[PDB]
Amino acid sequence: MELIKGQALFLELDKKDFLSLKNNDKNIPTFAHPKNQEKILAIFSLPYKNPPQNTKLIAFYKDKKEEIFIKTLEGNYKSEKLQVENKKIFPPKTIQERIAKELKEANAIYSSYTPKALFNGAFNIPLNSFITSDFGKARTFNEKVASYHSGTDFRAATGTPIYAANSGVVKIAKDRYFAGNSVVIDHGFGIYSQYYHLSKIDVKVGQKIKKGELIGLSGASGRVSGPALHFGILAGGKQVDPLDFVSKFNAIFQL
Ligand SMILES: CC(=O)N[C@@H](Cc1ccc(S(N)(=O)=O)cc1)C(=O)N[C@H](C)C(=O)NO
Ligand SMILES: [Zn+2]
């Protein structure tokens, strides 16, 4: 198979005699196929930054050991080189402490895997508006990706109501340094949706939330150039193309 870096892919495997799915040491979790009792699914994601050229996954069965090859594609992502440099980029120490703490909290959540589905049907778009900056937009320094856009921004005037893309459990609901007012929702199976730069948060950590339900109001908080809704998905432990993923997810999970 082939996959573009920064994308997720749904793997399908036989349910019976299946013991484990591995990439090197890493176990990859599995969940039931919703429409076929003899199948299981797994999600495999490539990082945007520093992917490997190729991936060899092994699915161990009682009497059998099948292999799976996935080649990394580049995609046609938007790319802006920086040759000028002059780089330093370090802030005060209690600000770095904030950045460090919020980062380790977020990884604790993103590492984690709820082994049941908290979602309900297909994902929705968090609001009915257009994209003003797509996932994958990169900044280059020396043929290396310095940074990239880890979600997709929708046009939204400050105060634009924002709805939950799917059901789940709210895991974050506070102002953070880079993301500003942010809500992160656990949908199960290590799938997290993200809603950043909000002007107002309408949910509490731990709170169960249904697809469609209001989560807050759009805003301009955090590292942004103006008011917009930043929408991201994390799955397979990686930030992935939000709209692509929604599209792949709904193909399996409608009804
Ligand atoms: C630490 C970092 O990498 N920040 C990046 C991406 C970013 C945001 C949030 C997070 S999390 N889930 O708290 O670890 C990681 C990475 C970033 O500046 N995103 C800005 C807010 C954006 O998207 N503007 O439209
Ligand atoms: Zn964004």
Side-chain angles (χ1 to χ4, degrees), residues 1-83 89-255:
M1 297 177 94
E2 315 194 298
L3 183 61
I4 301 210
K5 54 154 173 175
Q7 297 208 338
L9 138 76
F10 284 74
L11 298 169
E12 180 174 302
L13 306 174
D14 285 338
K15 196 223 279 333
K16 190 57 192 155
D17 291 7
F18 170 82
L19 306 177
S20 108
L21 164 63
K22 304 197 189 192
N23 183 40
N24 304 314
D25 350 304
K26 278 105 226 133
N27 282 283
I28 295 167
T30 55
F31 41 100
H33 196 292
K35 282 159 155 81
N36 189 10
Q37 163 79 24
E38 306 293 324
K39 295 301 179 170
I40 52 165
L41 291 162
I43 296 165
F44 173 78
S45 315
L46 293 168
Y48 190 96
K49 190 260 149 193
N50 209 39
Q53 268 292 353
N54 294 283
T55 304
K56 167 143 60 95
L57 304 179
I58 294 169
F60 299 93
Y61 283 80
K62 280 164 180 158
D63 49 327
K64 193 211 298 157
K65 182 185 80 169
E66 208 203 51
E67 279 198 22
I68 303 190
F69 298 95
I70 297 105
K71 206 232 169 185
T72 305
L73 307 185
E74 279 308 300
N76 297 324
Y77 285 117
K78 279 135 103 194
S79 204
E80 310 162 6
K81 310 198 278 110
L82 274 306
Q83 47 100 326
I89 83 210
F90 230 43
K93 310 317 175 214
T94 51
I95 298 210
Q96 282 165 213
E97 279 179 38
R98 183 181 190 170
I99 291 169
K101 186 196 84 95
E102 285 168 347
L103 170 58
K104 225 49 223 53
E105 290 174 77
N107 268 299
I109 293 152
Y110 301 142
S111 289
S112 141
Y113 176 95
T114 309
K116 64 200 278 157
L118 308 168
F119 58 81
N120 181 57
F123 278 75
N124 288 332
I125 275 310
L127 83 172
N128 314 93
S129 114
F130 54 110
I131 302 313
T132 53
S133 190
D134 336 290
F135 180 88
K137 218 172 209 175
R139 277 65 68 171
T140 273
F141 194 176
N142 180 25
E143 238 190 330
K144 263 109 135 122
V145 173
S147 76
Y148 72 106
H149 193 209
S150 49
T152 324
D153 306 330
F154 290 76
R155 193 274 180 293
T158 295
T160 299
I162 304 302
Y163 303 95
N166 212 333
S167 301
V169 171
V170 172
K171 308 304 293 188
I172 300 183
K174 80 195 178 155
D175 183 78
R176 291 146 98 212
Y177 187 79
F178 291 123
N181 285 312
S182 40
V183 160
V184 173
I185 305 172
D186 185 355
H187 296 293
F189 305 142
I191 301 164
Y192 302 89
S193 62
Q194 311 177 128
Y195 315 81
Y196 298 168
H197 315 310
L198 306 171
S199 67
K200 167 141 148 121
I201 301 180
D202 285 337
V203 293
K204 301 255 147 181
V205 177
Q207 178 177 344
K208 273 142 187 204
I209 180 99
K210 300 191 288 202
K211 180 164 63 167
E213 200 149 50
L214 180 71
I215 62 128
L217 307 177
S218 80
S221 43
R223 221 188 183 263
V224 282
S225 66
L229 170 95
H230 167 115
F231 179 62
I233 296 270
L234 192 141
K238 327 297 220 298
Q239 290 297 3
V240 304
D241 189 309
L243 297 177
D244 174 65
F245 174 96
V246 166
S247 182
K248 288 163 176 180
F249 184 87
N250 301 351
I252 305 163
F253 284 98
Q254 291 260 25
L255 285 288

